[PDB]
Scaffold this active site. Structure first.
Site, PDB file in Angstrom:
ATOM      1  N   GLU A 354       0.827  -1.192   0.000  1.00  0.00           N
ATOM      2  CA  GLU A 354       0.000   0.000   0.000  1.00  0.00           C
ATOM      3  C   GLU A 354       0.868   1.251   0.000  1.00  0.00           C
ATOM      4  O   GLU A 354       1.811   1.328   0.790  1.00  0.00           O
ATOM      5  CB  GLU A 354      -0.870   0.033   1.235  1.00  0.00           C
ATOM      6  CG  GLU A 354      -1.564   1.324   1.541  1.00  0.00           C
ATOM      7  CD  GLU A 354      -1.940   1.529   2.994  1.00  0.00           C
ATOM      8  OE1 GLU A 354      -1.900   0.578   3.784  1.00  0.00           O
ATOM      9  OE2 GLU A 354      -2.260   2.676   3.330  1.00  0.00           O
ATOM     10  N   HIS A 440      -2.942  -6.876  10.362  1.00  0.00           N
ATOM     11  CA  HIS A 440      -3.631  -7.976   9.698  1.00  0.00           C
ATOM     12  C   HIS A 440      -3.275  -9.296  10.338  1.00  0.00           C
ATOM     13  O   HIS A 440      -2.610 -10.174   9.752  1.00  0.00           O
ATOM     14  CB  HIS A 440      -3.204  -8.048   8.220  1.00  0.00           C
ATOM     15  CG  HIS A 440      -3.307  -6.814   7.434  1.00  0.00           C
ATOM     16  ND1 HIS A 440      -2.626  -6.711   6.239  1.00  0.00           N
ATOM     17  CD2 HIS A 440      -3.976  -5.637   7.609  1.00  0.00           C
ATOM     18  CE1 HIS A 440      -2.872  -5.498   5.769  1.00  0.00           C
ATOM     19  NE2 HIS A 440      -3.688  -4.822   6.547  1.00  0.00           N
ATOM     20  N   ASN A 478      -4.501  -7.073   1.466  1.00  0.00           N
ATOM     21  CA  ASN A 478      -5.386  -6.658   2.584  1.00  0.00           C
ATOM     22  C   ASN A 478      -6.403  -7.753   2.835  1.00  0.00           C
ATOM     23  O   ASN A 478      -7.014  -8.257   1.882  1.00  0.00           O
ATOM     24  CB  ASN A 478      -6.065  -5.344   2.200  1.00  0.00           C
ATOM     25  CG  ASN A 478      -5.084  -4.191   2.252  1.00  0.00           C
ATOM     26  OD1 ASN A 478      -4.595  -3.778   1.203  1.00  0.00           O
ATOM     27  ND2 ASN A 478      -4.877  -3.696   3.432  1.00  0.00           N
TER      28      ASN A 478
HETATM   29  C1  LIG Z   1      -5.082   0.178  11.340  1.00  0.00           C
HETATM   30  C2  LIG Z   1      -5.665  -0.978  10.521  1.00  0.00           C
HETATM   31  C3  LIG Z   1      -5.764  -0.880   9.170  1.00  0.00           C
HETATM   32  C4  LIG Z   1      -6.317  -1.911   8.408  1.00  0.00           C
HETATM   33  N1  LIG Z   1      -6.537  -1.654   7.045  1.00  0.00           N
HETATM   34  C5  LIG Z   1      -7.155  -2.733   6.313  1.00  0.00           C
HETATM   35  C6  LIG Z   1      -7.675  -2.442   5.015  1.00  0.00           C
HETATM   36  O1  LIG Z   1      -7.644  -1.341   4.453  1.00  0.00           O
HETATM   37  N2  LIG Z   1      -8.160  -3.555   4.363  1.00  0.00           N
HETATM   38  C7  LIG Z   1      -8.149  -4.847   4.905  1.00  0.00           C
HETATM   39  O2  LIG Z   1      -8.525  -5.785   4.159  1.00  0.00           O
HETATM   40  N3  LIG Z   1      -7.853  -5.046   6.188  1.00  0.00           N
HETATM   41  C8  LIG Z   1      -7.393  -3.981   6.848  1.00  0.00           C
HETATM   42  N4  LIG Z   1      -7.156  -4.180   8.210  1.00  0.00           N
HETATM   43  C9  LIG Z   1      -7.374  -5.515   8.764  1.00  0.00           C
HETATM   44  C10 LIG Z   1      -8.872  -5.847   9.017  1.00  0.00           C
HETATM   45  O3  LIG Z   1      -9.472  -4.743   9.681  1.00  0.00           O
HETATM   46  C11 LIG Z   1      -8.977  -7.147   9.774  1.00  0.00           C
HETATM   47  O4  LIG Z   1      -8.303  -8.138   9.015  1.00  0.00           O
HETATM   48  C12 LIG Z   1     -10.401  -7.599  10.037  1.00  0.00           C
HETATM   49  O5  LIG Z   1     -11.089  -6.566  10.745  1.00  0.00           O
HETATM   50  C13 LIG Z   1     -10.442  -8.855  10.771  1.00  0.00           C
HETATM   51  O6  LIG Z   1     -11.831  -9.308  10.876  1.00  0.00           O
HETATM   52  P1  LIG Z   1     -12.268 -10.396  11.941  1.00  0.00           P
HETATM   53  O7  LIG Z   1     -13.681 -10.684  11.703  1.00  0.00           O
HETATM   54  O8  LIG Z   1     -11.320 -11.521  11.976  1.00  0.00           O
HETATM   55  O9  LIG Z   1     -12.086  -9.640  13.353  1.00  0.00           O
HETATM   56  P2  LIG Z   1     -12.248  -8.146  13.898  1.00  0.00           P
HETATM   57  O10 LIG Z   1     -12.696  -7.231  12.812  1.00  0.00           O
HETATM   58  O11 LIG Z   1     -10.994  -7.796  14.630  1.00  0.00           O
HETATM   59  O12 LIG Z   1     -13.491  -8.234  14.903  1.00  0.00           O
HETATM   60  C14 LIG Z   1     -13.423  -8.999  16.184  1.00  0.00           C
HETATM   61  C15 LIG Z   1     -14.514  -8.323  17.028  1.00  0.00           C
HETATM   62  O13 LIG Z   1     -14.671  -9.236  18.164  1.00  0.00           O
HETATM   63  C16 LIG Z   1     -14.692  -8.444  19.384  1.00  0.00           C
HETATM   64  N5  LIG Z   1     -14.252  -9.304  20.440  1.00  0.00           N
HETATM   65  C17 LIG Z   1     -13.016  -9.860  20.640  1.00  0.00           C
HETATM   66  N6  LIG Z   1     -12.981 -10.706  21.612  1.00  0.00           N
HETATM   67  C18 LIG Z   1     -14.252 -10.710  22.146  1.00  0.00           C
HETATM   68  C19 LIG Z   1     -14.813 -11.397  23.237  1.00  0.00           C
HETATM   69  N7  LIG Z   1     -14.122 -12.290  23.976  1.00  0.00           N
HETATM   70  N8  LIG Z   1     -16.103 -11.165  23.516  1.00  0.00           N
HETATM   71  C20 LIG Z   1     -16.764 -10.281  22.768  1.00  0.00           C
HETATM   72  N9  LIG Z   1     -16.335  -9.577  21.736  1.00  0.00           N
HETATM   73  C21 LIG Z   1     -15.040  -9.869  21.434  1.00  0.00           C
HETATM   74  C22 LIG Z   1     -13.793  -7.293  19.044  1.00  0.00           C
HETATM   75  O14 LIG Z   1     -13.969  -6.210  19.996  1.00  0.00           O
HETATM   76  C23 LIG Z   1     -14.148  -6.954  17.610  1.00  0.00           C
HETATM   77  O15 LIG Z   1     -15.199  -6.007  17.492  1.00  0.00           O
HETATM   78  C24 LIG Z   1      -6.714  -3.104   9.014  1.00  0.00           C
HETATM   79  C25 LIG Z   1      -6.662  -3.181  10.397  1.00  0.00           C
HETATM   80  C26 LIG Z   1      -6.136  -2.122  11.187  1.00  0.00           C
HETATM   81  C27 LIG Z   1      -6.069  -2.281  12.677  1.00  0.00           C
END
Ligand SMILES: Cc1cc2nc3c(=O)[nH]c(=O)nc-3n(C[C@H](O)[C@H](O)[C@H](O)COP(=O)(O)OP(=O)(O)OC[C@H]3O[C@@H](n4cnc5c(N)ncnc54)[C@H](O)[C@@H]3O)c2cc1C
Length: 499
Positions: A354, A440, A478
């Site tokens: 990126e 990520h 991403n």
């Molecule tokens: C700064 C930054 C920039 C990024 N930019 C990109 C981008 O442009 N494009 C891209 O593809 N990816 C990007 N990512 C990565 C992407 O956001 C993640 O890969 C994605 O959000 C992961 O999805 P997930 O469903 O695995 O978990 P998450 O989106 O992390 O969601 C997990 C959720 O579970 C909740 N949770 C955790 N444990 C518990 C528990 N025990 N009880 C209840 N709730 C709980 C959390 O609070 C959270 O809301 C970025 C991430 C960050 C931090």
């Protein structure tokens, strides 16, 4: 506390897909989210703080704000002490790695850069050979793009606007080294962004907002999948509820201990919630910690040895180049990236980078990059019973292959242009490559290893993992589009065969 047919832990990508499809199938579903529903105007009248005005909303239970990585030299001046609060961005510190995750309804969709990118099919085929890549590319990926509200920047506007000068400078520089760029689709509404630049609508991307949330423009999951899930009439979302333990009940199904807190972190209640079908969408970190805890405290004793294994940071490395004075990157940089450098051919030198904006708001001549590399090193989450925490066994030397790949690509660009790295952006010590962060996180509960090929947890019935913990450490791009598409595939199948 009580019984719900289905519980979904978390409200990120895996969770949100799962809950929508469960609701559409008529399964009453409760989602448990440890963070807040972000819908309350704060002291500036906005829901989220910007990157130049961070406050307690910026951070999950820290006592001082922090500059976005790459930006400390310019943004430390705006840092302040804060009360520990249920803010939106959590820096999770492990021994030699800091993982950044979103906290709130929508998970990382609240804080991420919006970049919606499909992996190279040949790489998908390498990393997940047990999965049918045909249905992924011809059915699930398209479904995910449509539901996520992916859209595409107008190229004429891109080419003209001051807000993307930074991107055009790196494109020119990369071109002199024989490297091409790609436009990056996004969930931020680019039409909205045009009108921001024209002064027609409230700014967000053009007012230095992204990593603590966007007050406008960004179609996070609360607007897309979760809004749709709520619209089924079969889904509800409880916030400031953290799942702590999971057990198989004596009579079938699963029971959870759940702590309800206020936004100051005070414990208000501990509740018992039980269900028939349990879906983990707590992220790579959160889902994996729940399962290592349950295995190693004896509440899900039939979990296998692959629970906890196979974690990687998607090869994430940050680096920066010092431009020539005649190549300023601009004081006005959109906070949403639009271009990447695609140097990814599945070999060990692969990089997808990126072209990252910087928030300083004055001319610095710096070009910033977030590189995605192919590094076979993996870590393991192990349970620490003393502190009741999963600890990530990763060491900084495990990122040496990632550093090496990123450096070889950016050395080409520097050689072609007669430029050098910046060495001062990540701390005092000369360091051109940030190698101990992750945006990520991928793995911990890998598809086909800890689970079957649809995320059914091995050893258990009606127990599912849905999220980034399924991905074997790397996707080359991403990750959220892949998490979303994989969740579409998985929940469809689970509902058809199991529910
Ligand atoms: C700064 C930054 C920039 C990024 N930019 C990109 C981008 O442009 N494009 C891209 O593809 N990816 C990007 N990512 C990565 C992407 O956001 C993640 O890969 C994605 O959000 C992961 O999805 P997930 O469903 O695995 O978990 P998450 O989106 O992390 O969601 C997990 C959720 O579970 C909740 N949770 C955790 N444990 C518990 C528990 N025990 N009880 C209840 N709730 C709980 C959390 O609070 C959270 O809301 C970025 C991430 C960050 C931090």
């Amino acid at each position: 506390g009580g019984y719900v047919p289905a519980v979904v832990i978390g409200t990120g990508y895996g969770a949100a897909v799962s809950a929508l499809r469960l609701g559409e199938a008529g399964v009453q579903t409760l989602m448990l989210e440890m963070g807040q529903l972000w819908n309350q105007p704060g002291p500036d009248g906005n829901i989220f703080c910007g990157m130049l005005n961070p406050d307690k909303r910026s951070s999950w239970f820290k006592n001082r704000t922090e500059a976005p990585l790459g930006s400390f030299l310019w943004l430390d001046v705006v840092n302040r002490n804060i009360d520990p609060y249920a803010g939106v961005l959590d820096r999770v510190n492990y021994d030699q790695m800091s993982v950044y995750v979103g906290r709130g309804v929508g998970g990382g969709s609240l804080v991420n850069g919006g970049m919606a990118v499909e992996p190279k099919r040949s790489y998908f085929e390498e990393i997940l050979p047990r999965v049918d890549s045909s249905e992924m590319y011809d059915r699930y990926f398209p479904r995910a793009n449509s539901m996520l509200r992916v859209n595409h920047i107008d190229t004429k506007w891109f080419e003209d606007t001051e807000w993307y000068k930074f991107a055009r400078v790196s494109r020119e520089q990369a071109g002199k080294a024989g490297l091409g760029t790609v436009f990056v689709p996004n969930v931020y509404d680019f039409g909205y962004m045009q009108r921001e630049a024209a002064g027609e609508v409230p700014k967000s991307a053009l007012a230095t907002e992204v990593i603590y949330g966007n007050n406008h423009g960004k179609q996070s999951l609360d607007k897309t999948y979760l809004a749709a899930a709520l619209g089924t009439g079969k889904v509800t979302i409880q916030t400031l509820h953290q799942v702590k333990t999971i057990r198989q009940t004596k009579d079938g199904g699963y029971a959870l201990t759940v702590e309800q807190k206020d936004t100051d972190g005070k414990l208000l209640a501990t509740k018992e919630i039980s269900c028939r079908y349990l879906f983990l969408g707590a992220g790579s970190l959160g889902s994996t910690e729940l399962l290592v805890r349950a295995r190693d405290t004896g509440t899900l004793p039939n979990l296998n040895s692959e629970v906890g294994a196979g974690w990687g940071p998607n090869g994430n490395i940050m680096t920066a180049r010092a431009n020539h004075m005649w190549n300023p990157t601009g004081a006005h940089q959109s906070s949403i990236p639009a271009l990447g450098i695609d140097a990814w051919d599945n070999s060990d030198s692969s990089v997808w980078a990126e072209i990252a904006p910087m928030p300083a708001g004055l001319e610095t001549w710096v070009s910033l990059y977030l590189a995605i590399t192919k590094n076979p090193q993996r870590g393991t989450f192990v349970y620490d019973a003393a502190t009741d925490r999963a600890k990530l066994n990763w060491t900084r030397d495990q990122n040496a292959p990632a550093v090496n790949a990123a450096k070889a690509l950016f050395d080409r660009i520097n050689k072609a242009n007669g430029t050098i790295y910046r060495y001062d952006l990540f701390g005092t010590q000369l360091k051109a490559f940030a190698d101990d962060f992750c945006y990520h996180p991928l793995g911990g509960c890998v598809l086909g290893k800890a689970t079957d090929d649809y995320g059914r947890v091995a050893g258990y019935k009606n127990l599912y993992v849905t999220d980034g913990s399924l991905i074997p450490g790397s996707v080359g791009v991403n990750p959220f589009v892949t998490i979303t598409a994989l969740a579409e595939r998985n929940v469809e199948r689970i509902i058809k065969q199991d529910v």
